[PDB]
């Protein structure tokens, strides 16, 4: 499983300013968390899939 | 592809104030002296020839 993300440099500046959060870490904090949720869903999904 | 159109700016920074004042000039153009009563009296003493 894999995922990608595309953030512009100027967005990193604006997000670092104004609000005050690093634009880079959020996408890493989103993609990695999202993938783990899907796998954690797939394990649950298979159980109901295979249940009698 | 998160551009800068996704993040919405907050309060714009106030960089500069701009007042408008004339180069007021009356200390140098006239001669001033504080009067201690609501009526100010100047003395004009003139030197006259025998023809006034």
Swiss-Prot record, chain A:
Post-translational modification: A proteolytic cleavage by the prohead core protein protease gives rise to the mature major capsid protein during virus maturation.
Shown segment, full-protein numbering: 264 to 315 of 521
Organism encoding this protein: Enterobacteria phage T4
Protein name according to UniProt: Major capsid protein
Family to which the UniProt record says this protein belongs: Belongs to the Tevenvirinae major capsid protein family.
Function, in words: Major capsid protein that self-associates to form hexamers, building most of the capsid in association with pentons made of the capsid vertex protein and one dodecamer of the portal protein. The major capsid protein self-associates to form 160 hexamers, building most of the T=13 laevo capsid. Folding of major capsid protein requires the assistance of two chaperones, the host chaperone groL acting with the phage encoded gp23-specific chaperone, gp31. The capsid also contains two nonessential outer capsid proteins, Hoc and Soc, which decorate the capsid surface.
Domain of life: Viruses
Subunit structure: Homohexamer. Interacts with the portal protein. Interacts with the capsid vertex protein that forms pentamers. Interacts with hoc; one hoc molecule associates with each capsid hexamer. Interacts with soc; this interaction reinforces the capsid structure. A total of 960 subunits of the major capsid protein forms the 160 hexamers.
Curated annotation (Swiss-Prot), chain B:
TM region positions: none
Entry superkingdom: Viruses
Changes after translation: Proteolytic cleavage at the N-terminus by the prohead core protein protease gives rise to the mature capsid vertex protein.
Subunit structure: Homopentamer. Interacts with the portal protein. Interacts with the major capsid protein that forms 160 hexamers.
Function: Capsid protein that self-associates to form pentons, building the capsid in association with hexamers of the major capsid protein and one dodecamer of the portal protein. The capsid vertex protein self-associates to form 11 pentons, building the T=13 laevo capsid in association with 160 hexamers of the major capsid protein.
Family: Belongs to the Tevenvirinae capsid vertex family.
Name this polypeptide is given: Capsid vertex protein
Upper lineage: Viruses, Duplodnaviria, Heunggongvirae, Uroviricota, Caudoviricetes
Gene: 24
Stretch of the intact protein here: 11 to 62 of 427
